[PDB]
Amino acid sequence: EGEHQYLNLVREILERGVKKDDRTGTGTLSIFGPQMRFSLRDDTIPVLTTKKIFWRGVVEELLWFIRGNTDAKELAKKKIHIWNANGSREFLDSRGLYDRAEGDLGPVYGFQWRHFGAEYDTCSSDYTGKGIDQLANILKTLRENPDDRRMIMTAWNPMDLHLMALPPCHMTAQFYVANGELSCQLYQRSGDVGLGVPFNIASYSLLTHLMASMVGLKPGEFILTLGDAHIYNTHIEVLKKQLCRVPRPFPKLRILMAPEKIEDFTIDMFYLEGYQPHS
Amino acid sequence: SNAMEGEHQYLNLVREILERGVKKDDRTGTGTLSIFGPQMRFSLRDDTIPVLTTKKIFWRGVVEELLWFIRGNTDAKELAKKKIHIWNANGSREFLDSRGLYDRAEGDLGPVYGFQWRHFGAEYDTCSSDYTGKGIDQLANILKTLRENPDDRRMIMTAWNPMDLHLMALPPCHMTAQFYVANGELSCQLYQRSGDVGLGVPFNIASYSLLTHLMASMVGLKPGEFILTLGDAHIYNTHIEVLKKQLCRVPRPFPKLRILMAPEKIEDFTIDMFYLEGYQPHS
Ligand SMILES: O=c1ccn([C@H]2C[C@H](O)[C@@H](COP(=O)(O)O)O2)c(=O)[nH]1
Ligand SMILES: O=c1ccn([C@H]2C[C@H](O)[C@@H](COP(=O)(O)O)O2)c(=O)[nH]1
């Protein structure tokens, strides 16, 4: 049912979610363990049509993850300011990272993907050949042994959590191949269904399409498995309004080229075709 | 996944892989029927524990393997002493040599499951080594969080340590678990990257459901649900006919777990402290 899976999850949380408080104390409606499956066949990419998704933000954040970058200032340079708050002096101080420079998020997401286990210094440091390159290893495995049942990429490193501005949310992904098609399952421990989740869906779906082009496979499915899937009490009314919007068909991703190395992908190499969101 | 489908979810999953699974080769290439991403949900309410009734589950094996994980133990010889021989093959001289672990003593599985639960990040020496206060005790940290901040969305326990994989006899299967609390009920979701639906999966279901029941008793919570999320869910070509025969079996109601006491520390639980009530499997 495509987008209707997302909209039915919103509906389910509104109707059956339990009243649960978050870190600050801000209330949520919550359910545990829901799953959503999106077809990536016929170039489809699940970018929501009932709300306009910040596609440029999705792309730049992903490429920044793929490069193994952790400097929020590098995103701020591209006019993507989604990570600036968690890289602020006041926020880093609140986490006990007083020595850490402004915008230096620590060994978050991408650093774990490309350099798992490497000793973190700063965001500007040279990490070439440091730690375990999980992403490069998955790409080599998809080319040489696509039936492998261990194609895991994790950002969940218990030893580095204290060094991160925030612990990973979209924490573990698994890759799978069947009938020349690449599928991805993301385990996400916590999901703000109203804000973060639509962005995570577009992000990992883009990652799967990009990875498929790297290894001569076709995109299959993207599965999002959530832990605590919740709606903030402040979002209920705006989400109720979004539920009345009739979805339009999902856009198609057009990849113009794939470079030799996945970290050399630029926003110019691919684009959304027929993206018609509600205004 | 729907909680009150009980054992029918499992029988529907077997039927699903049988009818819709793709022909996929494994490590050796023995052949499987495979599907990606299926989920099962089991209610642990009213003391229910999802131990399959369409096939007899080795309950004593489930229990002793779990307690051995909870203790952070990795010596297959310690399991063998309890007449549980399920890990003996992967601890054998021939198998350890096949993994390039020639220096490794027989039965020493390396930093597998339980060692990661209790000592994530600790430097592994042998199975007999003293690891008291070494590495990150994920299980003890989850238990403290369940007592102090049950709404926490970071109660993760992982065995997936990329740096230790080469030291293990086998990479972790049941790799990451998340805990959750709502209305005084404890739920567990397990992410399992690979599942042999015919053999390992029924055992993993009973194992993590037992762990949830045990953890709840430790922290004054009631068991809620156990969610199993699979990556590659498969059936080996050699099991197709035996599984088709199991599909003709009508499930009986699930047994109930009776916990007599909970010790101060979870690693001090013994098989004598709890038992299965009304377990009626097909013979
Ligand atoms: O990619 C992300 C990152 C964060 N969040 C949301 C989930 C929670 O509402 C919040 C993080 O809070 P904790 O789960 O860490 O408490 O941000 C997402 O939805 N997606
Ligand atoms: O707790 C476990 C451990 C293993 N397996 C099965 C899954 C696979 O059939 C096999 C392990 O093989 P790989 O996924 O590592 O290739 O054992 C399970 O079902 N459950």
Side-chain angles (χ1 to χ4, degrees):
Chain A
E1 53 178 348
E3 191 156 355
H4 281 287
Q5 269 179 108
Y6 171 80
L7 303 163
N8 291 332
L9 173 62
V10 173
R11 243 162 230 129
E12 186 185 10
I13 302 163
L14 294 174
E15 189 88 327
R16 303 181 334 94
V18 299
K19 281 197 149 193
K20 203 161 170 285
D21 301 278
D22 98 316
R23 296 154 296 174
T24 45
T26 314
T28 69
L29 284 179
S30 175
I31 68 167
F32 189 59
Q35 194 183 73
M36 294 182 283
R37 308 183 73 100
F38 306 90
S39 183
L40 307 178
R41 291 179 190 87
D42 305 295
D43 312 291
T44 298
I45 185 164
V47 182
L48 301 195
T49 72
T50 58
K51 190 181 76 172
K52 184 185 124 38
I53 301 305
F54 187 29
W55 176 250
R56 201 173 68 75
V58 169
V59 174
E60 297 297 1
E61 188 201 38
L62 182 66
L63 300 183
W64 173 85
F65 288 158
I66 296 171
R67 291 191 296 268
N69 292 152
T70 59
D71 194 353
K73 305 181 119 157
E74 286 314 310
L75 272 176
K77 275 178 179 182
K78 284 154 191 288
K79 273 268 166 192
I80 306 301
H81 309 305
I82 69 177
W83 272 105
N84 288 176
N86 299 297
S88 71
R89 165 72 14 250
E90 314 87 69
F91 190 83
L92 286 166
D93 284 348
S94 91
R95 291 283 293 206
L97 283 1
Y98 318 101
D99 300 314
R100 190 75 64 66
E102 206 139 14
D104 191 338
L105 305 161
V108 296
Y109 298 110
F111 180 91
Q112 300 300 331
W113 293 7
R114 313 308 309 257
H115 315 288
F116 199 101
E119 224 214 298
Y120 196 80
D121 185 34
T122 78
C123 52
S124 303
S125 303
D126 184 16
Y127 296 114
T128 309
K130 302 284 171 199
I132 300 156
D133 196 340
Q134 297 178 94
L135 186 54
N137 291 186
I138 290 155
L139 294 171
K140 184 193 184 90
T141 311
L142 289 167
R143 295 182 194 112
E144 297 172 5
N145 184 32
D147 298 331
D148 187 89
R149 305 187 283 228
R150 298 91 170 258
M151 300 183 280
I152 307 294
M153 189 172 66
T154 190
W156 199 266
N157 186 351
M159 293 165 295
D160 283 7
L161 299 174
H162 67 110
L163 298 173
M164 302 179 194
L166 285 178
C169 230
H170 43 103
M171 50 178 279
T172 305
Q174 185 177 7
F175 298 89
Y176 173 96
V177 181
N179 304 135
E181 293 180 330
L182 176 65
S183 294
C184 170
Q185 181 165 210
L186 169 70
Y187 188 82
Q188 184 168 327
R189 57 160 191 87
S190 188
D192 183 344
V193 169
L195 211 90
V197 169
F199 204 100
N200 298 118
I201 294 163
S203 187
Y204 280 82
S205 291
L206 174 59
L207 179 61
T208 309
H209 278 274
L210 295 189
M211 285 169 79
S213 72
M214 290 300 294
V215 302
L217 289 173
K218 297 205 91 161
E221 254 191 307
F222 168 61
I223 306 115
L224 173 65
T225 296
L226 280 164
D228 187 332
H230 54 272
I231 290 167
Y232 283 91
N233 288 337
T234 53
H235 299 165
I236 293 168
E237 288 307 309
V238 60
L239 283 171
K240 279 169 154 159
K241 263 110 144 185
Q242 187 186 164
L243 286 172
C244 296
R245 269 116 93 100
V246 178
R248 276 100 181 243
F250 277 141
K252 304 224 160 294
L253 187 77
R254 299 297 171 199
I255 293 166
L256 296 167
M257 63 154 284
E260 192 194 88
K261 297 173 178 180
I262 199 166
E263 57 271 12
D264 298 332
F265 256 118
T266 66
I267 194 160
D268 299 285
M269 293 177 187
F270 51 86
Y271 64 85
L272 289 187
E273 184 192 275
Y275 183 47
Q276 288 152 14
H278 280 273
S279 196
Chain B
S1 57
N2 310 299
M4 282 329 287
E5 256 168 58
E7 194 167 347
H8 288 102
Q9 288 174 89
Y10 174 77
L11 302 170
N12 291 340
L13 176 66
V14 170
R15 184 62 70 187
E16 189 179 9
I17 300 163
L18 244 29
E19 285 174 343
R20 296 192 329 99
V22 299
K23 283 179 167 191
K24 204 164 169 281
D25 278 286
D26 52 284
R27 195 129 309 272
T28 65
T30 22
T32 70
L33 285 180
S34 174
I35 69 166
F36 189 58
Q39 192 186 69
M40 295 188 280
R41 188 181 293 261
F42 307 90
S43 179
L44 302 182
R45 292 178 189 87
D46 307 294
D47 313 291
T48 298
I49 184 163
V51 182
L52 302 195
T53 71
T54 57
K55 190 183 72 172
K56 186 187 173 300
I57 301 308
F58 186 30
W59 178 247
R60 201 172 66 78
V62 169
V63 175
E64 297 296 358
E65 187 201 40
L66 183 63
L67 302 181
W68 174 85
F69 287 158
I70 297 170
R71 291 191 295 269
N73 293 152
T74 59
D75 194 353
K77 306 182 114 62
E78 286 313 310
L79 238 32
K81 274 178 180 181
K82 283 155 192 289
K83 274 275 186 76
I84 279 122
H85 309 290
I86 70 175
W87 273 104
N88 290 178
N90 299 297
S92 71
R93 163 74 12 251
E94 314 87 69
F95 191 83
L96 292 172
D97 291 328
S98 90
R99 291 285 86 97
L101 312 150
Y102 319 99
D103 298 314
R104 183 71 66 71
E106 209 156 7
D108 192 338
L109 305 162
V112 297
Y113 298 110
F115 179 92
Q116 300 300 331
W117 294 6
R118 314 307 308 254
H119 319 288
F120 194 101
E123 226 217 299
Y124 196 81
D125 179 35
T126 54
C127 52
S128 301
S129 311
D130 183 18
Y131 296 114
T132 313
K134 302 285 171 198
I136 301 159
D137 196 339
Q138 297 176 94
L139 215 200
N141 292 356
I142 291 155
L143 294 173
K144 184 189 165 70
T145 310
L146 284 175
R147 294 183 194 112
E148 296 173 5
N149 183 31
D151 300 329
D152 188 88
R153 306 185 284 222
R154 297 92 166 259
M155 299 184 279
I156 308 294
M157 189 172 66
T158 189
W160 199 265
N161 186 351
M163 296 162 290
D164 284 7
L165 299 172
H166 67 110
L167 298 173
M168 303 180 194
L170 287 176
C173 231
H174 43 104
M175 49 178 280
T176 305
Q178 185 177 5
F179 299 89
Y180 173 96
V181 179
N183 308 326
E185 292 181 327
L186 177 65
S187 292
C188 177
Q189 180 167 204
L190 169 69
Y191 188 82
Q192 183 168 326
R193 58 160 190 87
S194 187
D196 177 356
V197 170
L199 209 89
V201 169
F203 203 101
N204 297 119
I205 293 163
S207 186
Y208 280 81
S209 296
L210 175 60
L211 177 65
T212 313
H213 274 281
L214 301 180
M215 289 170 78
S217 76
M218 286 296 291
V219 302
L221 288 174
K222 298 214 93 174
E225 286 167 8
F226 167 66
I227 306 140
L228 172 65
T229 297
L230 281 164
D232 187 330
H234 55 274
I235 289 164
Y236 282 92
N237 288 337
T238 54
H239 301 164
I240 294 167
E241 287 305 311
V242 164
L243 283 171
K244 279 168 155 163
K245 266 156 191 284
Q246 189 183 163
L247 286 172
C248 301
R249 274 125 175 250
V250 178
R252 274 101 180 243
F254 275 142
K256 304 222 161 293
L257 188 78
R258 300 293 170 197
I259 295 163
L260 298 169
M261 63 153 284
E264 192 192 81
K265 299 174 177 186
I266 199 166
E267 57 270 19
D268 298 333
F269 256 116
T270 65
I271 195 159
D272 299 286
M273 294 177 187
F274 51 87
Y275 64 91
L276 236 45
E277 182 192 88
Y279 184 45
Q280 288 152 16
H282 281 273
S283 55

